[PDB]
């Protein structure tokens, strides 16, 4: 049995379910939540369930969490321009908090798709090379082309050993 409560939170599939990819402006997200109370239950669940998913998709964003410092829970984002975006998450479900932050400071699906395509621009199927980078190492693998001499012996007339013998014979 995996240790801890809700061990599914410690699986790569769960971490990849996060959908909030912050814009490049977002630099820090401080989370102020209270460990005791009734109006801060959603914030506590947001720290428990959602903060891992947010960090997984935003490795360069500093998430620092403070406990029992204020009467109510809130989220404050620090942007590169110097703006500070305060969010009030009291009486809000953990799912509601995720949707709110996605709207205001989350990249759109169109933007994310474009980046994925650009990343793969330099991979070409026709390119030959090692398996890590290319589909086929050599043209011998292609159908109809002369096969590799190791797998299939070449005709004698196509061999330097044979050609050199003829030149001596000439």
């Amino acid at each position: 049995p995996m240790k801890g409560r809700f061990p599914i939170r410690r699986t790569l599939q769960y971490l990849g379910r996060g959908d909030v990819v912050f814009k490049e402006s977002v630099k820090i997200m401080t989370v102020n939540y209270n460990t005791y109370g009734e109006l801060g239950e959603g914030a506590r669940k947001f720290v428990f369930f959602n903060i891992p998913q947010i960090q997984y998709k935003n490795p360069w964003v500093q998430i620092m969490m403070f406990k029992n410092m204020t009467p109510s829970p809130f989220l404050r984002f620090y942007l590169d321009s110097g703006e500070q975006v305060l969010v009030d998450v009291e009486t809000k479900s953990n799912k509601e908090i995720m949707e709110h932050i996605k709207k205001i400071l989350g990249k759109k699906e169109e933007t994310l798709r474009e980046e994925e395509l650009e990343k793969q621009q330099r991979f070409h199927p026709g390119n030959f090379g090692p398996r890590k980078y290319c589909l086929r190492e050599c043209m011998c693998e292609v159908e109809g082309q002369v096969p590799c001499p190791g797998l299939v012996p070449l005709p004698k007339e196509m061999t330097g050993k044979y050609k050199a013998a003829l030149k001596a014979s000439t």
């Binding site: 699986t11 401080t30 891992p52």
Partner: protein, 113 residues
């Protein structure tokens, strides 16, 4: 007005020391994923920050701005803001003084003092 090279253009941390002149030692923490356990833990870093007015006290949360030119070997940030003062917090949501999870001044009232 080119910006710093350092990755940490904006860092939040706690002032863990203030015994250097016009400098505040700040401990920042980030979340790092343990690859074996797939759980996040806290990796903490120390940042020297220029406290021009010596307005920082141990235990207060602060925001640092990366300096364009390193002031010294270790001082590469300045104190942008004091997010939370130690024991003197002001609620961001309501704006009233607080002492923990309680209001020193009720939000219903309008003291304007």
């Amino acid at each position: 007005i080119v910006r710093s090279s350092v990755h940490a253009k904006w860092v939040v941390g706690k002032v863990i020391g203030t015994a250097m002149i016009k400098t505040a030692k700040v401990r920042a923490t980030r979340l790092v994923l343990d690859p074996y356990l797939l759980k996040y833990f806290n990796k903490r870093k120390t940042y020297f920050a220029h406290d021009a007015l010596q307005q920082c006290s141990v235990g207060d949360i602060v925001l640092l701005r990366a300096l364009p030119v390193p002031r010294s070997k270790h001082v590469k940030h300045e104190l942008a803001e004091i997010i939370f003062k130690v024991g003197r917090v002001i609620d961001p949501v309501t704006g009233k003084p607080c002492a923990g999870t309680a209001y020193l001044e009720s939000p219903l009232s309008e003291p304007r003092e």
